[PDB]
Amino acid sequence: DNPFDAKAWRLVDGFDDLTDITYHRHVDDATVRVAFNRPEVRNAFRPHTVDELYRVLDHARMSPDVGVVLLTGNGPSPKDGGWAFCSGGDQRIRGRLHILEVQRLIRFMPKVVICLVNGWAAGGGHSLHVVCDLTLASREYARFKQTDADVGSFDGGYGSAYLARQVGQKFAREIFFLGRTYTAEQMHQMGAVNAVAEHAELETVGLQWAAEINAKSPQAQRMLKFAFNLLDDGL
Amino acid sequence: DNPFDAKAWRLVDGFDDLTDITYHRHVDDATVRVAFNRPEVRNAFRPHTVDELYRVLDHARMSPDVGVVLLTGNGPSPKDGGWAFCSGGDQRIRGRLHILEVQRLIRFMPKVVICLVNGWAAGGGHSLHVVCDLTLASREYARFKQTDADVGSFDGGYGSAYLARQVGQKFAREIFFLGRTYTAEQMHQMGAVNAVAEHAELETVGLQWAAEINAKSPQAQRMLKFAFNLLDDGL
Amino acid sequence: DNPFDAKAWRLVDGFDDLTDITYHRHVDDATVRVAFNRPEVRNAFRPHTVDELYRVLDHARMSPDVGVVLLTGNGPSPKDGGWAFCSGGDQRIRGRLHILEVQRLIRFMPKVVICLVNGWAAGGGHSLHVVCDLTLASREYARFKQTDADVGSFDGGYGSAYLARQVGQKFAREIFFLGRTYTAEQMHQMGAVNAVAEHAELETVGLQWAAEINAKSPQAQRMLKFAFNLLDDGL
Amino acid sequence: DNPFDAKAWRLVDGFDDLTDITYHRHVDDATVRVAFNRPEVRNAFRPHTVDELYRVLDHARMSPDVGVVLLTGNGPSPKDGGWAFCSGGDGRLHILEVQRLIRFMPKVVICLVNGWAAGGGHSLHVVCDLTLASREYARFKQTSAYLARQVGQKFAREIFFLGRTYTAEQMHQMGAVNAVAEHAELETVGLQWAAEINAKS
Amino acid sequence: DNPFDAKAWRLVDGFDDLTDITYHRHVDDATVRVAFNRPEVRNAFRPHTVDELYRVLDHARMSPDVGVVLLTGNGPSPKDGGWAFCSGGDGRLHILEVQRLIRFMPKVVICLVNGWAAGGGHSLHVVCDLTLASREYARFKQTSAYLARQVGQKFAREIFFLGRTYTAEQMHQMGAVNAVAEHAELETVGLQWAAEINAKS
Amino acid sequence: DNPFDAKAWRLVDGFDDLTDITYHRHVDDATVRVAFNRPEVRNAFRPHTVDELYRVLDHARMSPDVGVVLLTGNGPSPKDGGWAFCSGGDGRLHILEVQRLIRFMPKVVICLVNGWAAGGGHSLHVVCDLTLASREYARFKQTSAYLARQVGQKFAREIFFLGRTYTAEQMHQMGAVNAVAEHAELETVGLQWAAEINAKS
């Protein structure tokens, strides 16, 4: 039932030193798979993780033959069989190396990034999903929770404006102010999740979406992402 | 079946002269209840009502030990058993003291305001719900209707931009241009109502939402409200 | 089962030379019907079509006794019985007279334009629906597809910002990046379609919506459209 | 030295009942003059003033043969000889509804700041399409969003946070005032600007 | 006195079929020159001009070794000796698509306003990243949103509503023109600005 | 000639452990002074500096009796005698979180640019409510959105794309600097501005 179809992927050269992240290129498609690789700790990021994540995504950005990024989490946990996309950072922080660098990179890179939420997406992991261009989520195991325990500042979690421009001001304020946990279906209804997929099919669906994106003119796709980010179609 | 659990509340000191509004503080929680108190006239506001409403909300804003405001309407009408949050102002006006003052106050006060729509929310009452941070609505009796009969000017009802940033441009234009009546469920689907609650449970649910809000860092909550209002996370 | 109730309409004077568009005024209501009239080619527009469409809408804009525009497509195709609102322009263009002129006119004219999507709305036809104030869609036959094959430039289809302000950033990016086909119900759920109607009743419903709009103060309606376009209620 | 040229203006039919505002139509031009008429209290508006102002602006907005509205204040003060456009607040309409009408109406509204523009009076000037200001007597004082869209965020925050008084020239340099005119010529220039607008119409 | 230095530019391979636009690559620099080439009609664009302009701008956008686009107009007019950047409209592409490409492309586009910039020509200048303008001959005339984001709402409304003609210096003071240059040196300065951009690249 | 008047300031209780930042409360006024204290490295911030800066700004934000924050840099450099506000980046907090706090806090933050403001140091100045700058020594260099909301898009793109160095006067004319002050008087003026703000409070 694992979403990851290993035989469909190959390691990207030049990243032999990765420990916290996996980075693969599809055997056929102009699509890469970037994944948190710490299932034993629910794919939480430490500063080292963020550094790897940034370098990997930056490489994907600069790779001429890569059109689409699939961003996900490896699993399950060997300990409890649990599934996580990313549980966020240090949940006791108040008592690249910073996730804001990665969120900025995802937002502005001229390529489409699809988040495949295979499990828990909490704290910094939640905001990571939010900033991706598209999100596909595991019907069975995706869980969405906006929390700021991994935020060093006292002024709230990140990406509130992005979320509000997806689900509207009322839902976005609810998600941030209460920090409740939501299912894939609930988030889909609110407008933060594009589609819900069967868990075992999550990456298969992700690959299909990527193929449809890659089949179109790359110039149109990058210009559209720019326009969407600008909130102005330039016309 | 009344949403109001009297024994759970106490009058806030210093408002003995209130006639059109009730103002209570929870016996335990950092939560206040502010309610229209004219059920016999469907909780319509007259200029005096607006003055009281403003002073009460302003006091809540300045109260260090108040985190959350629940804004609602008392009921039912003794005359027809009807339920109203607020039916708006003078529906023949064209043939704080002004509701825009209150809407501004709600929007900008650094505390979360939850509208509990227990019945009709029409005209100025509709826009009042719209400007609140969150809205919970009575499944059985909430009714939403955007109308401008209580507006002195000829240039439309208030808060169109706020609504559009909740339900999107198409739905917001429909709500304003046609002025149809909608149920709690319909408004929830469109994105202007956070959750639908059983009528008798409306304030119980409201208190639960307030508690979850109050359990978090107050600094994060006020900074987030500011960011949401700004349409910019400041990052 | 045809949505068009001919006896309810009369030709607007001064347009005897129209070939690609029909232009009628209701026998009783301050409502006009503007329709693509090339069902045999799925209501695709050629430059001549755009010129006619512009002149007709511009006339509607300047007509003191016209409140509301219903924009639709005539059908069905005699060839395959298919239904189209508008299939867009020249799908091999890359190997007012321009549709952007019409989209601008619709967006800014101080009257409410309701798109009645009676069938395929693709390419430029899709963006035409998007820019209308309201959209009602045929349950059975409406189909929505954002594609740019009829776009002369390499930088993407039009109206991305408008769509994002209706369905949110996630759904809008999906609609543009993948260019999938959606039903009336799907688009209604996402927030780009106001209501779904039975095919045979589409114009009947359209006329009802127009009547409700026309029953209100015209000054309020035009001032509200301006505010909605501005993203600012001016208060 | 008074900006108002009586010979150039005629009262608008049906407004003889106005007490706080004056409303004239130019003898020849497609231009109207709408002015605060409480110079004895620095042209502060009471609720009645707001209602009259809305009524008049709405009528101008509805006038097919009018292209430009000159919004100003009458003076000087019979109390202390001071000059005021509008000193702000001193009731069916809210002043914000007046601002909304000014901003959204399909006419050009030119604010002629003939003196103090303070508080709500300052806000009124800001929302007008264009502003012309008396070199000698215009005084601007905010006692924010829209202002920032004219002078930039740094200057707008300065104006709001320090609450200093600024001259016509100072506001012109910052970008909130289109042009500075000699006091006596303020309405003459306003009419000239209106004439150019109506010619391009 | 002509801004164009023939010795500094080479034609771009594959564009010998251009009739309304010229397209050069600098002899040494990562900079191209794209110019309206209808000086006989004040560099107004017909539908064919728009198509050529899009084609050329797209090619520049696709050029890995080019960092800066100088957008200008050739002159003077062989008809009346006047100078024009672009006088606006005189057909598969819309001019708005040209504006979108100018705004979104990962190259810096510097408009060199060498004369009249009117109507659609004015809009084209506005959407460019930077504008340098001929002191002697630049003339700006709008015959709004984006302009307001450069000069503020008051000035933008003035430019649109009165439709006056403005000089390089006037537009520089308002914030729509980065710098004013002597006519003969306009392209030299443009190249110098481009050089600084490419050095920071 | 040093802007800092030791007699006017007192250390804030509980911050004796600061190494990269200084934090003073004015002897009489509801004003604090927060300053980069790495003049030996042009007041560049390391991760530790960001953490200290956030801690201090948060404390100021929490201070009921403080209305204004003066944000500046100590100098001159004991290494080369240069003057720096902040030269940018040289770790639980991100500098963006510092910018968010500066922008959102219910206090007025006045940046006193006493020297180089480059890279992240330039961005810090931009997000402050107000900026006062040393005539002699302020130097602005971006090595964009928010800046454009102060100087307009054309000038903001110039600042970003060419990466030139600008003086206090130049940035004042463009709208990113509220006022220029003599170096020795920079903090005196800052205190005077703060005094006006606190008086209007």
Curated annotation (Swiss-Prot), chains A, B, C:
Protein's pathway: Quinol/quinone metabolism; 1,4-dihydroxy-2-naphthoate biosynthesis; 1,4-dihydroxy-2-naphthoate from chorismate: step 6/7; Quinol/quinone metabolism; menaquinone biosynthesis
Record-annotated site: Important for catalysis: D148
GO MF annotation terms: 1,4-dihydroxy-2-naphthoyl-CoA synthase activity
Binding positions (substrate): R42, S87, G88, G89, D90, Q91, W120, A121, A122, G123, G124, T147, S153
Transmembrane segments: none
Source superkingdom: Bacteria
Reactions this protein catalyses: 2-succinylbenzoyl-CoA + H(+) = 1,4-dihydroxy-2-naphthoyl-CoA + H2O
EC code: 4.1.3.36
Keyword annotations from UniProtKB, A to Z: Lyase, Menaquinone biosynthesis
A biological process term (GO) from this entry: menaquinone biosynthetic process
Stated family: Belongs to the enoyl-CoA hydratase/isomerase family. MenB subfamily.
Function: Converts o-succinylbenzoyl-CoA (OSB-CoA) to 1,4-dihydroxy-2-naphthoyl-CoA (DHNA-CoA).
UniProt-recorded name of the protein: 1,4-dihydroxy-2-naphthoyl-CoA synthase
Source species of the chain: Mycobacterium tuberculosis (strain CDC 1551 / Oshkosh)
Organism lineage string: Bacteria, Bacillati, Actinomycetota, Actinomycetes, Mycobacteriales
Gene symbol of the encoding locus: menB
Parent sequence residues shown: 17 to 272 of 314
